[PDB]
Design an enzyme around this catalytic site. Sequence first.
Site, PDB file in Angstrom:
ATOM      1  N   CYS A 124      -6.679  -2.804  -6.665  1.00 12.24           N
ATOM      2  CA  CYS A 124      -5.766  -2.962  -5.554  1.00 12.24           C
ATOM      3  C   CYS A 124      -6.645  -3.042  -4.313  1.00 12.24           C
ATOM      4  O   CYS A 124      -7.606  -3.809  -4.301  1.00 12.24           O
ATOM      5  CB  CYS A 124      -4.752  -1.816  -5.506  1.00 12.24           C
ATOM      6  SG  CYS A 124      -5.384  -0.204  -6.015  1.00 12.24           S
TER       7      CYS A 124
ATOM      8  N   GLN B 144      -1.409   7.795  -5.599  1.00 12.33           N
ATOM      9  CA  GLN B 144      -1.649   8.252  -4.242  1.00 12.33           C
ATOM     10  C   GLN B 144      -0.448   8.886  -3.549  1.00 12.33           C
ATOM     11  O   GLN B 144      -0.604   9.476  -2.480  1.00 12.33           O
ATOM     12  CB  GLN B 144      -2.176   7.086  -3.404  1.00 12.33           C
ATOM     13  CG  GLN B 144      -3.681   6.893  -3.559  1.00 12.33           C
ATOM     14  CD  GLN B 144      -4.475   7.996  -2.885  1.00 12.33           C
ATOM     15  OE1 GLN B 144      -4.591   8.025  -1.665  1.00 12.33           O
ATOM     16  NE2 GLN B 144      -5.027   8.910  -3.680  1.00 12.33           N
TER      17      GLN B 144
ATOM     18  N   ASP C 255       0.844  -1.190   0.000  1.00  7.35           N
ATOM     19  CA  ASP C 255       0.000   0.000   0.000  1.00  7.35           C
ATOM     20  C   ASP C 255       0.875   1.233   0.000  1.00  7.35           C
ATOM     21  O   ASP C 255       1.857   1.292   0.734  1.00  7.35           O
ATOM     22  CB  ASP C 255      -0.896   0.071   1.243  1.00  7.35           C
ATOM     23  CG  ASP C 255      -1.873  -1.073   1.346  1.00  7.35           C
ATOM     24  OD1 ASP C 255      -2.198  -1.456   2.487  1.00  7.35           O
ATOM     25  OD2 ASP C 255      -2.336  -1.577   0.305  1.00  7.35           O
TER      26      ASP C 255
ATOM     27  N   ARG D 111      -2.214   2.054  -6.530  1.00  9.78           N
ATOM     28  CA  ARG D 111      -1.489   1.122  -7.370  1.00  9.78           C
ATOM     29  C   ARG D 111      -2.179   0.930  -8.722  1.00  9.78           C
ATOM     30  O   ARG D 111      -1.513   0.890  -9.756  1.00  9.78           O
ATOM     31  CB  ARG D 111      -1.317  -0.211  -6.630  1.00  9.78           C
ATOM     32  CG  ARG D 111      -0.345  -0.098  -5.447  1.00  9.78           C
ATOM     33  CD  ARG D 111      -0.510  -1.231  -4.430  1.00  9.78           C
ATOM     34  NE  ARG D 111      -1.707  -1.059  -3.611  1.00  9.78           N
ATOM     35  CZ  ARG D 111      -2.013  -1.819  -2.566  1.00  9.78           C
ATOM     36  NH1 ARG D 111      -1.213  -2.821  -2.199  1.00  9.78           N
ATOM     37  NH2 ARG D 111      -3.120  -1.581  -1.882  1.00  9.78           N
ATOM     38  N   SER D 112      -3.507   0.841  -8.721  1.00  4.98           N
ATOM     39  CA  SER D 112      -4.254   0.700  -9.971  1.00  4.98           C
ATOM     40  C   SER D 112      -4.041   1.903 -10.871  1.00  4.98           C
ATOM     41  O   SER D 112      -3.882   1.755 -12.079  1.00  4.98           O
ATOM     42  CB  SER D 112      -5.750   0.514  -9.706  1.00  4.98           C
ATOM     43  OG  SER D 112      -5.987  -0.720  -9.065  1.00  4.98           O
TER      44      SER D 112
END
EC number: 3.1.3.48
Length: 293
Positions: free
Chosen positions: A214, A257, A180, A220-221
């Site tokens: 994710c 992110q 994450d 991550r996506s």
Amino acid sequence: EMEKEFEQIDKSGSWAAIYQDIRHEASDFPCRVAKLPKNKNRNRYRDVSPFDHSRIKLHQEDNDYINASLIKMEEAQRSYILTQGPLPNTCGHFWEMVWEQKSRGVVMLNRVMEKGSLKCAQYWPQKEEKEMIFEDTNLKLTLISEDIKSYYTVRQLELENLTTQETREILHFHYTTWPDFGVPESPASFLNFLFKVRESGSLSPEHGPVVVHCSAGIGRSGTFCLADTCLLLMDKRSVDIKKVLLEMRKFRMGLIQTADQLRFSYLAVIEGAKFIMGDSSVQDQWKELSHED
Ligand SMILES: CNC(=O)[C@H](Cc1ccc(C(F)(F)P(=O)(O)O)c(Br)c1)NS(C)(=O)=O
Ligand SMILES: [Cl-]
Ligand SMILES: [Cl-]
Ligand SMILES: [Cl-]
């Protein structure tokens, strides 16, 4: 050239500044359906919701809601569905979406447990002899085979519509070493995985959009899809990654992110461009550096 751009950003130390600009300039669209009281137990995170205009609708009377967004990149000529890691109660909905949208590939970029906490439901069978049946959406899911590498696994799944007894092969691409809010081990590791997805046929325009997820379906996506889209553009075409990310963020909030994920996207696109420009050897070089064996 984005190599020149990259080094200047690195020299100025402006990755955090650029990333904060992107967050400030990003589209703000309503998510009224996501925020309906009846849909509270269909959302993994209260602060991560699909926009109404791009959300995937389940083809059902009772409740068509799923936390999933259609990202349609017009110029790049590719669509993605980005979604959260399914909840124990939305696994049926997830595979309903896969069926209805005619997807043939699922890309998973998280682990079901990270740092001792659950981030995603076990929505696919881990063993051939333990198939899954989703009673609410009348689907059957069987593990047919799997190809396990050091940091990712490719699974061959059979998804069956029990109503019509039609079956489809779904390929499941599971990246298991991307934590994450983190980055992949290396550009080589990421690109070796991406091109595995590309060469599988799952991204064929004759298929529905690949499903990418994710835990939240944004960090991550978003990184995965940004890099793939930019590489597509570099081939069709001077690619402005900030501009491409802002375009993607029209379809789903919060894509990418961290500033370091943004930096990594640059690294991945720059390195991947070598293959685009025609250097064969780079692909097996990635494979060696990825240590997948
Ligand atoms: C800041 N918000 C949170 O941490 C979570 C939602 C969330 C957002 C993004 C991710 C991720 F970036 F790691 P992804 O790659 O998209 O899965 C995660 Br994990 C979680 N919301 S909260 C504060 O309610 O827990
Ligand atoms: Cl309601
Ligand atoms: Cl896992
Ligand atoms: Cl954000």
